[PDB]
Amino acid sequence: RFLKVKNWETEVVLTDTLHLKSTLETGCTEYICMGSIMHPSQHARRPEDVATKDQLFPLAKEFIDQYYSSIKRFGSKAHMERLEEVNKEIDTTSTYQLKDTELIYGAKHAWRNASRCVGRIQWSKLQVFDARDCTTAHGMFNYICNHVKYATNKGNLRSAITIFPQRTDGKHDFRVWNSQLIRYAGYKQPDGSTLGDPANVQFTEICIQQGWKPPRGRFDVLPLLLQANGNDPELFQIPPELVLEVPIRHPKFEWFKDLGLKWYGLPAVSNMLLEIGGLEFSACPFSGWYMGTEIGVRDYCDNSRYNILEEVAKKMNLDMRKTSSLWKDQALVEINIAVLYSFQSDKVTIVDHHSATESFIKHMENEYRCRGGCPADWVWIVPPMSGSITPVFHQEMLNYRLTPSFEYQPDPWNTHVWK
Amino acid sequence: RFLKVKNWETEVVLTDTLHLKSTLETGCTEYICMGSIMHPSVATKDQLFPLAKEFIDQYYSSIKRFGSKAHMERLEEVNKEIDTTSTYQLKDTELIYGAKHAWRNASRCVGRIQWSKLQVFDARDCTTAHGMFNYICNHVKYATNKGNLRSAITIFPQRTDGKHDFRVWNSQLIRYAGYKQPDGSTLGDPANVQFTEICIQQGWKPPRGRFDVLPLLLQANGNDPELFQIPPELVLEVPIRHPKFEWFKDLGLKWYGLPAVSNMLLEIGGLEFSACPFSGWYMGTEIGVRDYCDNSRYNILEEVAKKMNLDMRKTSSLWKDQALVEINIAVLYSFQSDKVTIVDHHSATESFIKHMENEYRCRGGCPADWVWIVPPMSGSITPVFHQEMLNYRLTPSFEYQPDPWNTHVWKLV
Numbered sequence: 001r002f003l004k005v006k007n008w009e010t011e012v013v014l015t016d017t018l019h020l021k022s023t024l025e026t027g028c029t030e031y032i033c034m035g036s037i038m039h040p041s042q043h044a045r046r047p048e049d050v051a052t053k054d055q056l057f058p059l060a061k062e063f064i065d066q067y068y069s070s071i072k073r074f075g076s077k078a079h080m081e082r083l084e085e086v087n088k089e090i091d092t093t094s095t096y097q098l099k100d101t102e103l104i105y106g107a108k109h110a111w112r113n114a115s116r117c118v119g120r121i122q123w124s125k126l127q128v129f130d131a132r133d134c135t136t137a138h139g140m141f142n143y144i145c146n147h148v149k150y151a152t153n154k155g156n157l158r159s160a161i162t163i164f165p166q167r168t169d170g171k172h173d174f175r176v177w178n179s180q181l182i183r184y185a186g187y188k189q190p191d192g193s194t195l196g197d198p199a200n201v202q203f204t205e206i207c208i209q210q211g212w213k214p215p216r217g218r219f220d221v222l223p224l225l226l227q228a229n230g231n232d233p234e235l236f237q238i239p240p241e242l243v244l245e246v247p248i249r250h251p252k253f254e255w256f257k258d259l260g261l262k263w264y265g266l267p268a269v270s271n272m273l274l275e276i277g278g279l280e281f282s283a284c285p286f287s288g289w290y291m292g293t294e295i296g297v298r299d300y301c302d303n304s305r306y307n308i309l310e311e312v313a314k315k316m317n318l319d320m321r322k323t324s325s326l327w328k329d330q331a332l333v334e335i336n337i338a339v340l341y342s343f344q345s346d347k348v349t350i351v352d353h354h355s356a357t358e359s360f361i362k363h364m365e366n367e368y369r370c371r372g373g374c375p376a377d378w379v380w381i382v383p384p385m386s387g388s389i390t391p392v393f394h395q396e397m398l399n400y401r402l403t404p405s406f407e408y409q410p411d412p413w414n415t416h417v418w419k
Numbered sequence: 420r421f422l423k424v425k426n427w428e429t430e431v432v433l434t435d436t437l438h439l440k441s442t443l444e445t446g447c448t449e450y451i452c453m454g455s456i457m458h459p460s461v462a463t464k465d466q467l468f469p470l471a472k473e474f475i476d477q478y479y480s481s482i483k484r485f486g487s488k489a490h491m492e493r494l495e496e497v498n499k500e501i502d503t504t505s506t507y508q509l510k511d512t513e514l515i516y517g518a519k520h521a522w523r524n525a526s527r528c529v530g531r532i533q534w535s536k537l538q539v540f541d542a543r544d545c546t547t548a549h550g551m552f553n554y555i556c557n558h559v560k561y562a563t564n565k566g567n568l569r570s571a572i573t574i575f576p577q578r579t580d581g582k583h584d585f586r587v588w589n590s591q592l593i594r595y596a597g598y599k600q601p602d603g604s605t606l607g608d609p610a611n612v613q614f615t616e617i618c619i620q621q622g623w624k625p626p627r628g629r630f631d632v633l634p635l636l637l638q639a640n641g642n643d644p645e646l647f648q649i650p651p652e653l654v655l656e657v658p659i660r661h662p663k664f665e666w667f668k669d670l671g672l673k674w675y676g677l678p679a680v681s682n683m684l685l686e687i688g689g690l691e692f693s694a695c696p697f698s699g700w701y702m703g704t705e706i707g708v709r710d711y712c713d714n715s716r717y718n719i720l721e722e723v724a725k726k727m728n729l730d731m732r733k734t735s736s737l738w739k740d741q742a743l744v745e746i747n748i749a750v751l752y753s754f755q756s757d758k759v760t761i762v763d764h765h766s767a768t769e770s771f772i773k774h775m776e777n778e779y780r781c782r783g784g785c786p787a788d789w790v791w792i793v794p795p796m797s798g799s800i801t802p803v804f805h806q807e808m809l810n811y812r813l814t815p816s817f818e819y820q821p822d823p824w825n826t827h828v829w830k831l832v
């Protein structure tokens with residue numbers, strides 16, 4: 001009827017009514033919680049392929065209603081005309097097209113609704129590039145390049161999303177096959193170990209199999225693998241002057257720069273699906289800026305990622321005989337100091353996990369004030385180091401699925417029929 | 420019918436069938452998840468019958484005697500008592516099995532690989548607070564074992580009508596007092612300020628120091644609770660020093676060696692044991708991250724960072740993170756040097772994965788609360804962070820219960 005959330009550090013209690021608008025299942029039941037399952041649910045708002053009218057139109061009506069409500073209308077002439085125009089359009093094309101205002105509203109609100117995103121205080125400050133006129137991989141490359149340049153902004157990063165044509169029947173999908181716009185290759189070495197980023201060994205192999213000539217380094221920016229209108233994907237090298245990179249150095253450990261580490265500045269997620277009023281934008285790359293832990297904890301220290309902890313600890317002369325010396329924890333901190341120090345020294349936008357989590361608490365408070373709630377996935381919001389010394393650790397969160405939303409989708413190479 | 424959990428670091432996939440036996444609520448709905456809520460929201464004869472049966476059935480199933488003569492007579496015997504007395508009495512075997520399985524079922528506990536090595540102290544014959552004191556003293560001395568810590572639970576008489584509850588008013592058996600000062604500052608453990616006040620009001624004469632072990636506040640049979648000082652020779656404490664920083668010992672930090680939770684309710688076959696203090700040994704982060712560095716707690720981050728010459732002007736220096744690791748190093752180093760059992764969070768989380776995998780193999784699952792299993796520091800560099808976990812409520816279970824001062828109706832005019 002109304003659920004409260006408490007912050008156990010501050011004793012602030014917030015009352016959530018927004019969850020009454022939740023549309024699709026979380027995966028949880030009264031008898032089992034799936035809050036740590038990465039992909040708990042397959043409940044999707046529309047069937048797999050081109051849906052019937054009684055399937056697509058109710059979702060369309062819901063979103064148009066929501067948008068016109070959002071702008072202090074509902075029932076107005078323009079809203080009632082919009083419904084009938086969406087009605088005729090589905091009647092004659094089995095789909096409908098969003099107005100530019102509706103598209104922008106939907107994209108910002110999918111970011112707003114992203115329960116796993118700690119950076120959502122920025123949600124209304126998103127630059128939306130409408131790419132729905134795109135027809136070819138070359139066009140997608142052009143759009144993505146402009147995205148990267150605008151978003152990077154010589155280090156003063158800007159949040160942006162570029163929205164390619166929506167799904168129609170499923171055989172003409174636009175996809176960015178890359179999971180992120182900028183990632184490093186991963187190479188399976190002859191012995192058995194891995195050079196570069198081990199997460200990308202398979203995508204790297206597709207690219208090589210697709211004709212990419214790997215430089216076979218540890219930080220080879222992958223090509224773009226762009227699919228337009230269901231056709232076979234195409235390789236494009238992003239112009240390197242558009243890929244801003246930060247060499248990682250340490251403010252005290254001078255030997256740290258000699259680890260030869262760098263990272264890219266633009267996190268740009270490109271494998272997710274943006275759903276608005278039953279429409280599915282299968283190619284919608286979006287970018288913001290890094291929280292330092294993403295690089296420094298996960299990218300650098302995950303065992304199946306760059307896995308640098310041991311080498312850093314070595315150089316720090318740490319007791320690595322046993323776990324109880326906390327050599328992993330000590331190196332982990334120094335690595336994340338270096339990552340933040342390097343990005344800040346190069347004037348590349350980055351936020352530490354203390355600032356970001358504090359911002360998110362403030363965002364929650366704003367959202368509960370004006371919206372009646374804020375869906376938040378504690379498992380993802382709490383940073384992967386020093387959790388309890390960040391405010392979000394002590395903050396209860398309600399997780400629910402609002403629409404518009406970003407959704408996961410199958411990797412294209414599991415589903416694409418090659419021509 | 421089946422549910423799979425994946426470990427994204429290893430790709431191991433386990434198949435959970437055990438969840439089909441859960442019966443209590445999780446608090447979540449099909450449309451809202453409440454996985455991060457700390458606390459999401461007496462039995463009659465007819466309520467008690469199926470709960471008892473369910474537990475007796477599971478007990479005899481565990482010992483491969485389901486359907487047996489002994490199983491069927493026990494069921495009939497339990498039914499007699501519920502009909503006669505509106506309640507029943509567990510056999511000793513059932514009490515031990517029930518207590519161990521409440522631990523085994525504690526979704527929030529990372530130390531469950533040890534669940535079957537639980538020393539169960541039956542104190543259901545206790546009738547007075549003096550008696551509880553005696554039981555708790557023996558519990559502490561046994562558990563503490565001169566630093567070689569052993570898991571133990573002492574189970575006091577079950578709830579009858581709710582008017583005669585046994586309660587340990589302490590949240591834990593060993594805790595340090597907290598005193599608020601006129602100037603607003605806090606001396607000791609700020610968490611225990613309220614409970615320290617209750618004790619002082621009950622007549623406790625506080626030393627007013629930083630690490631005063633609180634007295635036990637013990638309630639027997641629904642009577643007013645009574646104060647007892649744990650004999651100081653039974654409270655094993657560890658002075659915290661750092662292997663590298665000579666100055667760390669100068670912070671005057673110490674901690675007690677025995678973590679012993681005493682405010683929970685043990686529920687076995689529908690019976691409620693409102694006083695069941697249990698203890699194990701510490702994971703270092705409980706002291707080094709939570710006890711010492713929570714802003715609401717001892718809050719020594721700035722002090723330690725200060726002595727570390729850290730730049731505390733900007734968060735992005737990660738001074739808090741850096742100071743936090745050192746504090747937790749000191750905590751582990753101190754206990755190990757004094758040969759007091761402790762486990763670091765890497766070893767603990769690794770054992771829990773082994774445990775969880777074994778439990779999936781021998782039991783069909785392992786309810787686990789990721790929000791609690793993941794340590795409060797260095798989260799993703801432990802294996803549990805990457806482990807998908809299903810959370811569900813099996814019984815026997817440990818349950819929260821109201822604090823006694825919020826419910827107790829005082830007798831003494």
Ligand code: HEM
Binds near residue numbers: 107116118120126290
């Ligand atoms: C502006 C700065 C931003 C910051 C600091 C930020 C931070 C984060 C972080 C740390 C995560 C968890 C990522 C991980 O562990 O893999 C995340 C997830 C996410 N972010 Fe944000 N984000 C930002 C902008 C954006 C924007 C512009 C969008 C979309 C318009 C967005 C949508 C999402 C979504 C959908 C997720 C869920 C990821 C998933 O389910 O895989 N974020 N964000």
Ligand code: HEM
Binds near residue numbers: 531572701762791
């Ligand atoms: C043997 C060594 C043990 C270790 C290393 C251990 C470790 C832990 C830790 C780190 C937590 C989280 C506590 C917190 O962060 O506040 C926890 C919770 C818990 N432990 Fe264990 N524990 C041990 C033994 C036991 C025993 C013997 C029992 C019961 C017989 C038990 C029952 C519980 C319960 C019920 C919880 C969660 C209670 C709640 O919801 O607050 N544990 N344990």
Ligand SMILES: CCN(C)CCc1cc(F)c(F)c(OCc2cc(C)cc(N)n2)c1
Binds near residue numbers: 266268287294
């Ligand atoms: C569970 C999936 N996980 C393995 C993905 C890891 C990953 C790799 C990568 F290169 C990324 F750019 C990435 O972006 C997340 C992200 C997105 C945005 C918009 C901002 C920030 N700040 N962060 C996430």
Ligand SMILES: CCN(C)CCc1cc(F)c(F)c(OCc2cc(C)cc(N)n2)c1
Binds near residue numbers: 679702
């Ligand atoms: C309210 C938040 N905070 C105070 C935690 C409360 C709490 C309640 C509880 F019942 C617990 F069992 C618990 O576990 C601590 C614990 C217990 C044991 C036996 C061993 C270790 N090593 N640790 C912690």
Ligand SMILES: C[C@H](O)[C@H](O)[C@H]1CNc2nc(N)[nH]c(=O)c2N1
Binds near residue numbers: 455456
């Ligand atoms: C709000 C959140 O549920 C709360 O801070 C939880 C998070 N995880 C925890 N995990 C453990 N082990 N102990 C705790 O007290 C908490 N607190």
Ligand SMILES: C[C@H](O)[C@H](O)[C@H]1CNc2nc(N)[nH]c(=O)c2N1
Binds near residue numbers: 379427806808
């Ligand atoms: C099993 C678990 O849900 C998985 O490791 C999650 C945990 N929390 C996370 N949180 C963030 N932000 N990103 C992640 O990839 C993950 N991984």
Ligand SMILES: [Zn+2]
Binds near residue numbers: 028
């Ligand atoms: Zn849930």
